[PDB]
Design a protein around this ligand. Structure first.
Ligand SMILES: [Pr+3]
Ligand SMILES: [Pr+3]
Lengths: 152, 145
């Protein structure tokens, strides 16, 4: 049934997933259905969502402190969106919009940070194990004439 | 400061490595030429089955526990060549892509989890009363608070 909690939850997840994906990626979930019904809903989501880019009440409500563990932010802000006991479709879509901004925010720190720590380990190993050898070769320009395949 | 100066070598290594990782994640003059040879050797390594096995036999999902051991292992015979130097950059890059392909979907799924959880607690009832999701097609307002 269209009003059964099972269809509402199933559809809501499909809609949320597709909405986050468009605004940002293999989630290994159920794939978003391409039938007409779902398509109509996804397009309605996009139109209301796009309009929320210039909704500054929402931008204010959603603006977070640098580090505060996304979990803290999320529940407080979401309750805040609904704390007067009112509901409408706009606030529901605002909830999806907020989740999407929170993904973006987390990724813009977690990803560079991840790249940095791994590059840190690598350049550190290079400095301590490989540097003298590279010096003895005359620097990095030796790379230009390497055509071998390494074995171990 | 000098092509053989450790300053210049580390500065160049940092740029090459960063650019290398950027290309793999996507899919000056002296430096661009280096970047190109590095891309070539990195591309050749994709079908270096010995390297490929070596990486396969390792738990790439726990990069912290594994990196220095494998790196040390690659040079454990005291020998050096440019291919092995590139293989280290290649390995690093693998760890990065492996982390991205796991942590990014996990991060997104966790946040979707909180959202759907909230929607179920707080909004499920209201949505039911709207007759379900199709109500969305009859909404042309904007929310205020
Ligand atoms: Pr060290
Ligand atoms: Pr709960």
């Amino acid at each position: 049934g269209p009003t059964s909690s099972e269809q509402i939850m199933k559809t809501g997840a499909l809609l949320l997933q597709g909405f986050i994906q468009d605004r940002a990626p293999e989630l290994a979930l159920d794939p978003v259905p391409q039938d007409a019904s779902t398509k109509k809903l996804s397009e309605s989501l996009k139109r209301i969502g796009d309009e929320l880019d210039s909704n500054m009440e929402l931008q204010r409500m959603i603006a977070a402190v640098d580090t505060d563990s996304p979990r803290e932010v999320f529940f407080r802000v979401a309750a805040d969106m609904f704390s007067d006991g009112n509901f409408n479709w706009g606030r529901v879509v605002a909830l999806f919009y907020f989740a999407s901004k929170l993904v973006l925010k987390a990724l813009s720190t977690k990803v560079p940070e991840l790249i940095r720590t791994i590059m840190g380990w690598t350049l550190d190993f290079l400095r301590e194990r490989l540097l003298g050898w590279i010096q003895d070769q005359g620097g990095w320009d030796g790379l230009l004439s390497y055509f071998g395949t390494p074995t171990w």
